[PDB]
Write a protein that binds this ligand. Sequence first.
Ligand SMILES: Cn1nnnc1NC(=O)c1ccc(C(F)(F)F)cc1S(C)(=O)=O
Ligand SMILES: Cn1nnnc1NC(=O)c1ccc(C(F)(F)F)cc1S(C)(=O)=O
Ligand SMILES: [Co+2]
Ligand SMILES: [Co+2]
Lengths: 381, 381
Amino acid sequence: KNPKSDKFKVKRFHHIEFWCGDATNVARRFSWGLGMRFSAKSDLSTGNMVHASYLLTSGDLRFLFTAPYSPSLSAGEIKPTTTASIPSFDHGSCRSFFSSHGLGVRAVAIEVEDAESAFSISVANGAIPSSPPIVLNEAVTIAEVKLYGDVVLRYVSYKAEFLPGFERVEDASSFPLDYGIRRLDHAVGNVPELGPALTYVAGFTGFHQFAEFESGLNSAVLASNDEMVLLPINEPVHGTKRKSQIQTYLEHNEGAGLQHLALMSEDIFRTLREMRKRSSIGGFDFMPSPPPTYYQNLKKRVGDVLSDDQIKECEELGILVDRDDQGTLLQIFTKPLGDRPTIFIEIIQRVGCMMYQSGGCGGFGKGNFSELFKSIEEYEK
Amino acid sequence: KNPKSDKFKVKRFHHIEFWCGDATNVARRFSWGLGMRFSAKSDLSTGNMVHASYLLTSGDLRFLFTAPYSPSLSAGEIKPTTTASIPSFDHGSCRSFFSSHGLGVRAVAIEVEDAESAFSISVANGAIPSSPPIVLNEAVTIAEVKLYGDVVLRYVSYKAEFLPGFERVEDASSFPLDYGIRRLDHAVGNVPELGPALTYVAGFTGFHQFAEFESGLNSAVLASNDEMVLLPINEPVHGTKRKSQIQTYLEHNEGAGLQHLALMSEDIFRTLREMRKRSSIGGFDFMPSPPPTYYQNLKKRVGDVLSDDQIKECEELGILVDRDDQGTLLQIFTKPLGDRPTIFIEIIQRVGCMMYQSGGCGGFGKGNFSELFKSIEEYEK
Ligand SMILES: Cn1nnnc1NC(=O)c1ccc(C(F)(F)F)cc1S(C)(=O)=O
Ligand SMILES: Cn1nnnc1NC(=O)c1ccc(C(F)(F)F)cc1S(C)(=O)=O
Ligand SMILES: [Co+2]
Ligand SMILES: [Co+2]
């Protein structure tokens, strides 16, 4: 069921912001690794004495990378006189985030009809405020509330190009890479206790539990009215033979934070071919492929959705497949994006549920846990 | 003249270590940008709970990238029980370095006959000690003294693979990139006062002033006995019409530090072709090309060293050329490697002074200051 209880008008995922120590190197590695173009900048060359911020785009997917300059550059400024293009930025908060968590996501940004109302209603409804609504050049309004750990849910709204004060990146610098990635499908947090995290977040958003379908985790998914903003949350299961990777996340991240970003591709086979070509030359590595038993059992499961050629192409690329009662899902996971075993990326493509495609079509790969266990067990013999 | 006054036996540049917030992303960007192979690692996968360190190699050039993990991972260790492969590493020192300087060089490492003696004689001769000599697995000895700002001169010596505790990187991960870079030619520091910096460093090394040949800087070059270890130092000139870029460095870096690394290529034309192909797809950008007047005046200067074809190839790639009384030098400079206008890279190739090639053959490009001024002046009209 879908009660459509959003307490304010939510549109779509707008951008994801990584807090970094050096934004240039992370941005350039991600661009090559994922096929995302440099499309806007806010830094010293644009008058910003506070932070360096570089935006990568692919389709509607926006990855923002931000790092602080030396505070001495802006020591004479005050908030009314700031040159920061993102007024919520804070040198100390940023350095503290990165030294506590390493490279990771600071802001999950969703676009809303009215960022001030969304902020006001949110905190009226239990949200811990993080940065009050601020109106940028009479054009854009931005506001932030705590989501979990040191991650904020950021609201953005436009009266009528990324943000004021950002400049388009010169086209000679902007090389039009594209490996097929098109938008953010879901952004997933890890926490020590699912219950209170769910209660808090659904409490101030009105997001409902997305209706779905013993190793690892327990999860639940929060979704907006049209279920295009999807915010799953995991917690660890303690005691198992294999140590919970959610617990490993919490230890290495120093607590709760964003675990994985799932990026929708319009052609997962082209995306995975292009990213795998670059794994060893600056891009991203992928988790170990499932054993061939897994693909031998795929025909009995999605033989009506994927031809024998498409299923063997899954085998080369290491793609996983799962299926709801309404759609089929193709998915694969990268290795951690940085030094720590914390944040990683998921590539997905959804087939089915056309009316546009409805959100979550196929679920999130729930069936692939038992299928992978049964496959390792079958293959071993 | 060359007094050969080294106070201890110095061999060659051994490696350069960057202190980072995330070593994975910097390392992967540098590898693609410069054509350096992943050759060794020390991290969680090798038992190191303290720091992540990744080594890139090209020829004899070794670039080490290191970042701290969460201190909680090693909270039960003490120095005798440490899992750090580089015993001089310190979480607080590293986080402080990166938050004060951003991405940059922490250690210039030279190999010496005996690292304990080199340390002892150095501090006996005025060197501020930074990390005392430590013997790694009865095989390698490492010691560190302050060089300038927060940069250390690191001594390494072997009784008889990078360091103990590092593992060779699996060849599937190791893609054999190579754009022709072969070794470190010189490593250059920026300081506010040349005099005391020279006095201190030459004081404890015995390095002599390398004998050489109004906009910017004043410099001098320190060299070892055979002049293969070259450590130039700059200071700003205040008052000029154009603000000294040494002063800009000092302000943005929060003080003294390593300004540029000069990497020797065995074929600067192949190197610059390969790096320029990648500038906009994750690699490095280059400083703006000199005006064509500069290349029109090149025939009158190195017409006997470079054919008309080689000089026009310089024009495409933006290469600078200079000439001593013994050799010719080809050089070009990258844009800053990271967010701040601080550290950058120089690519060079030296032609002449064969007996092997003697160090510094051609100088360091002194003549290119007046030649560039005269070129901008000539071209303008
Ligand atoms: C619940 N949820 N919400 N958003 N995403 C998710 N689940 C996943 O994406 C997911 C799906 C399948 C697997 C499996 F079985 F292949 F290992 C692992 C994950 S995993 C550990 O979490 O990455
Ligand atoms: C003295 N020294 N020691 N080691 N390296 C050096 N000099 C250089 O490499 C050098 C050489 C020529 C130019 C010029 F004229 F093209 F701008 C700029 C530099 S620069 C600012 O310093 O990068
Ligand atoms: Co997922
Ligand atoms: Co130089």
